[PDB]
Design a protein around this ligand. Sequence first.
Ligand SMILES: [K+]
Ligand SMILES: [K+]
Ligand SMILES: [K+]
Ligand SMILES: [K+]
Ligand SMILES: [K+]
Ligand SMILES: [Mg+2]
Ligand SMILES: [Mg+2]
Ligand SMILES: [Mg+2]
Ligand SMILES: [Mg+2]
Ligand SMILES: [Mg+2]
Ligand SMILES: [Mg+2]
Ligand SMILES: [Mg+2]
Ligand SMILES: [Mg+2]
Ligand SMILES: [Mg+2]
Ligand SMILES: [Mg+2]
Ligand SMILES: [Mg+2]
Ligand SMILES: [Mg+2]
Ligand SMILES: [Mg+2]
Ligand SMILES: [Mg+2]
Ligand SMILES: [Mg+2]
Ligand SMILES: [Mg+2]
Ligand SMILES: [Mg+2]
Lengths: 49, 159, 33, 175, 49
Amino acid sequence: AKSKNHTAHNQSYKAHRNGIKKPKRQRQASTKGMDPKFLRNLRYSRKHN
Amino acid sequence: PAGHGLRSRTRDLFARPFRKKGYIPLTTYLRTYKVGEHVDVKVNGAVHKGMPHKFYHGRTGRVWNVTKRAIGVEINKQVGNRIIKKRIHVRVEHVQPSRCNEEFLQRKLNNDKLKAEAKVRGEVISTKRQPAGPKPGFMVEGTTIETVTPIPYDVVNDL
Amino acid sequence: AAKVKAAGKAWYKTMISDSDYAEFDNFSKWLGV
Amino acid sequence: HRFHQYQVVGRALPAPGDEQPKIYRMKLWATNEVRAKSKFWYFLRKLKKVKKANGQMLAINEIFEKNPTTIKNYGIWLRYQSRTGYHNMYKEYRDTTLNGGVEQMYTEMASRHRVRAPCIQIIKTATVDFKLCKRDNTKQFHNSKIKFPLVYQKVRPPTRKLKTTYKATRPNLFM
Amino acid sequence: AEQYAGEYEAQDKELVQLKREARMKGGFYVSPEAKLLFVVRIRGINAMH
RNA sequence: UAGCUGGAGCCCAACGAGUUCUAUCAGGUAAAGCCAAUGAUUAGAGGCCUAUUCUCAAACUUUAAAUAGGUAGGAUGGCGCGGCUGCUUCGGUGAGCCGUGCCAUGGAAUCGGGCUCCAAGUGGGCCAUUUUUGGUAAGCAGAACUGGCGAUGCGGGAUGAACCGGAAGCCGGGUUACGGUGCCCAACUGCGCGCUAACCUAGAACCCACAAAGGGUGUUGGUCGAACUAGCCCCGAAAAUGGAUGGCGCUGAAGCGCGCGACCCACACCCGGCCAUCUGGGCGAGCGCCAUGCCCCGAUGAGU
Ligand SMILES: [K+]
Ligand SMILES: [K+]
Ligand SMILES: [K+]
Ligand SMILES: [K+]
Ligand SMILES: [K+]
Ligand SMILES: [Mg+2]
Ligand SMILES: [Mg+2]
Ligand SMILES: [Mg+2]
Ligand SMILES: [Mg+2]
Ligand SMILES: [Mg+2]
Ligand SMILES: [Mg+2]
Ligand SMILES: [Mg+2]
Ligand SMILES: [Mg+2]
Ligand SMILES: [Mg+2]
Ligand SMILES: [Mg+2]
Ligand SMILES: [Mg+2]
Ligand SMILES: [Mg+2]
Ligand SMILES: [Mg+2]
Ligand SMILES: [Mg+2]
Ligand SMILES: [Mg+2]
Ligand SMILES: [Mg+2]
Ligand SMILES: [Mg+2]
């Protein structure tokens, strides 16, 4: 017995029930993934303020 | 992976524009990007290091990191229910500064100057944009008027 | 009053004017040119 | 009257390129003003290159019959779309107003050719002297001694209060 | 309320004078474009895009 | 397993938005092109070459839409003064950050109240407008966007999961949608112009319940001249129980095309009463109350 393979039917309706969620705009965006140089230096500058 | 490679169906997308191949101009290489700036992503197919995935071609995002040969760009991606703020690193060859806020940046300076005048004169003003609306009444002088008529149908001249 | 009437008659003549119809060369006989 | 004649005046929007654009006028037949302006913008878009979004509407005025108590002969040149192709034809009518002739034209095209109002374009309207009328059934009513009987009477009560299901005798009608 | 009632007139009347004067010197006066709409929904809430 | 759903909350009220506008990016589908590259492809002309020429492309393309895509449209901003850095520069040179004093009429339209836990069922789908692949085709087989049925009654399409209208507490009154007004059947045998005559069962409601090439000196409108065109009608037109514009029937129609006025008509819309849900309120030196109560206000009511 064969069946259906793929469809996007009803998927966007499902996606909008709790309508598309935009991430929370936060002050002080995370510094993860920034280059470690200028990251340790910023840490040293803050420590010596 | 899983049926489609990294550069699948990019035959037209990553090709260079017509008669615009070969050397890359120096302007591409000495533009300055800072964290918080807006940039458009446009892959060029002659530079294979730092190449972003085909999804980010034609998307605009914020600069969040700057390295020696690349910048960090933050781009929204809708994945089912929500938007994921994707963070990718792209070489400067595939990125250009965005003009999506150029009209806003000049307007902010002008609104500051206009409100400065209202401070001097003591008035209260708005400096807030308003959409195009209904035109006011006006008069037009008596001039030549051309008459427009439906044209008789001609079979021969239809083609 | 007479100037009022003349403007109304001038306006009425413009409203009821008819085109030359001379630019339809091959349909000139079929039309009332 | 079902149909009215309007004179619609408009132009392209004044732009720095011209700033005093040309003025265009049309005489259009429509049921009201909103339908007259729409048909005007239809012809301006197709004949000139000015559509409603790039244009300005200046004036719209209804034309009226000068003498609605006399009988005129009315010629109409029209363009219509059939099931297979486009054709133009000339029609003649007798009416006290050109409004009646246009209503007559639209009714006749609907009956004889099954052509609806959207598929018709009035090329030209005019009044024709009885010496220059071309179609038959218009000349035969130019007889000054015109005489004939009424061959279909339509026996009916006058005001629907006098209507009864039954009658005691058959009607007598004669002509 | 007296001020508004007398303002509805002299606005209708002024447009009558303006149009007459335009014809008086042979031109067209263009009425100001409408600024207000009344919008009424004529279809139901079934099978909506 | 994630998504869709319920329950429990809790945290708060400028934040947003399945929308437009202003600005700014990105694209190679439709169309087009070959008189541009790659490929295919007909014909002559002039001297293999030159200038033309007919016709083409899902795995061709210089150009190149519509519709969809992304970003931005301030109080989470800006400017001085002063500091810190182990980073950066020839260099206070920069990149940032820290402190501090000032400035910022709220920066287009419209609309609006919106972090975590635990868990159910589901994981056979089907149909329709548009786009679209395979196949001669299929009530076939497979994709894209949206809606619908499934899970849903109610009015119309005679009848019918999906078509048209419209979604719903129990009622009174008024009015409509779709569809209709000869009878069945509530509402005109209403007012008006044409066309048709069927000796084929003439014809007569989207989906829909079929018809073609081709014909006619049937008839009625047109066009071009000294035949052509297109309306209705007729031929083309053959299946098995007896039979179906739904039936009877209808011929200045009760058929076809186009109008006018009124009328009929849904659980839809409006006003009103009542039940419930939700929202927001009032009630103590209490003559004071199933306070888990009573009173007031507004909206709402489909369900496997
Ligand atoms: K493949
Ligand atoms: K082209
Ligand atoms: K070619
Ligand atoms: K499961
Ligand atoms: K015929
Ligand atoms: Mg199947
Ligand atoms: Mg399955
Ligand atoms: Mg895998
Ligand atoms: Mg519907
Ligand atoms: Mg292509
Ligand atoms: Mg094509
Ligand atoms: Mg689950
Ligand atoms: Mg089921
Ligand atoms: Mg079932
Ligand atoms: Mg009622
Ligand atoms: Mg009748
Ligand atoms: Mg049926
Ligand atoms: Mg035939
Ligand atoms: Mg029936
Ligand atoms: Mg009620
Ligand atoms: Mg319920
Ligand atoms: Mg249950």
